[model samples]
Target chain A: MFRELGSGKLPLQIEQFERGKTIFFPGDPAERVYLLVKGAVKLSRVYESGEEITVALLRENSVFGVLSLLTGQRSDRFYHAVAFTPVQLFSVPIEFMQKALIERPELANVMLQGLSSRILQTEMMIETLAHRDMGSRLVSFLLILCRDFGIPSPDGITIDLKLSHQAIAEAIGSTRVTVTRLLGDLRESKLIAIHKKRITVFNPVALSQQFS
Target chain B: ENYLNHPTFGLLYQICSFGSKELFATLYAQRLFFLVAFDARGTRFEPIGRNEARMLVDNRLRQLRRDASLQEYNQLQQVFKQTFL
Candidate 1:
């Protein structure tokens, strides 16, 4: 629910940023939540050995900085709110957001819906981790991208995100070599095409059959 | 329905003609065959290991010469024809 507090209804403040801007760092205390208006933010955490793993990609209309707002817990990951292109964001200060929630009981339902949707996403990830083989897991990752951030063209459904093979490997619990091999297999089977940073799914059904 | 030739199935059929009638109908619908065979010795039999059974039959034929006289062979052949032919 959009809330108007100091201003009128929908009194949300917008912030714009260029590409390669760091919004927040790991261990930063939560002070506010941001609603993504446009662009993608990479959420990632560093290992003890200094290796980094991408936790998730936050896209337009998705909420970020919620962990800080929820329990005032320190974030384990760093959020770089970069504009793959130009970006617009609406940020709600935690105190004001809390006050608004107290006044609006209906807003609680909206927050519940948001939380439930995230839980469903997590449940699907768990299922993918449990049952999906390496090849199928990679397919699942591509399917998610196609559904979330794909551009439909004459040739195929082109994924707009620039994800590296290593990033994809971390997400699907496979090695870069395995992912590359399977990608080749998928391409040879006419399921998809890869052009540098972009991947286009030619046959969505054939690609998805790997999951089953 | 090949299970109908199984001894356990034969025992079941004698008891549950009503309760298991639907099961029997479904199996019959599937074009399953239930062939029951008997041996010349009056034994209700099913095929065992074919090669081993053949070897066993050969052994029995050899033992017949050692265990019985020439006249006994004619009697045994007649009995086998009456029972299985």
Candidate 2:
């Protein structure tokens, strides 16, 4: 579906960036799009009251910096394009995306799909925060980890992602203490184990049963 | 018997189980032999020998036997042991 996106005519520029590099600021006034070639980046927004909320974490091969097109309003969200490791990216100007959409028209459908999927993700997160328990939140997070960054090991399904318990709590809208206690319960139940910052899911079925 | 230093044990008394240090100490002060027996486990409060541990459990069991009159004991025992078949 994205076959023509990186074509020669697209004027895509490849660049390497270091970790913790800020790609886009909330009021920077730069209309640029970034296609992540490697590494991870976190998008966050800070309120006037100094409350910081992480909007999303985008990994390799993910397209980011489309807020200008998505909202049509001034960019109110800050995109911190931290590498987490050495990274490469394909940078495209927002003008190019707009022009392409005007020319092709078919890519508009793709952009709509992307926007709708993002809305669905936001809706799901809201639903989770409103109704789910601690165990359910953790299990839902594990399932996301399994889909996004799981590796098959002899022991079990291992999540290759490195995430702090604090990050997990923020993503699920829970307290770190609650997350720690629920993780301890999971460990004591022998459904999962943590080693070297990696989580090996031993009994996925049993762990998933908590959600239901 | 600072509650902060022994919070878990304090919680045990404060929540459900009876016999706070104040109550136990009052009884111990009045009954010298029971007081000495209570301290026999030694300072720093580690468990005594296996015999003493076994005796403690037996003592509790005997206390249970006395507390639950024969009429209540039979039904309580049956209810306690009635797990899934």
> Could you tell me every candidate's TM-score relative to the true structure?
0.60, 0.59
lDDT of 2 by residue, A107-188 (tens): 6785665566456545645655665567876776675555345556676667766767777776776778988898889889
Q: On a 0 to 100 scale, what is the lDDT of residue B31 in model 2?
A: 11
Instruction: Residues A105-158, candidate 1: write the lDDT tens digits.
Output: 676676665666556555656666665467667676676666556666566667
Q: How well is candidate 1 docked (DockQ)?
A: 0.01
**Candidates' lDDT values, in order?**
0.55, 0.54
Chain B TM-score, model 2, reads 0.31
What's the distance in Å from true for residue A185, model 1?
A: 2.0
Model 2, residue A184: distance off in Å is 1.7
Per-prediction DockQ comes to 0.01, 0.01
Docking class of 1: incorrect
DockQ of 2: 0.01
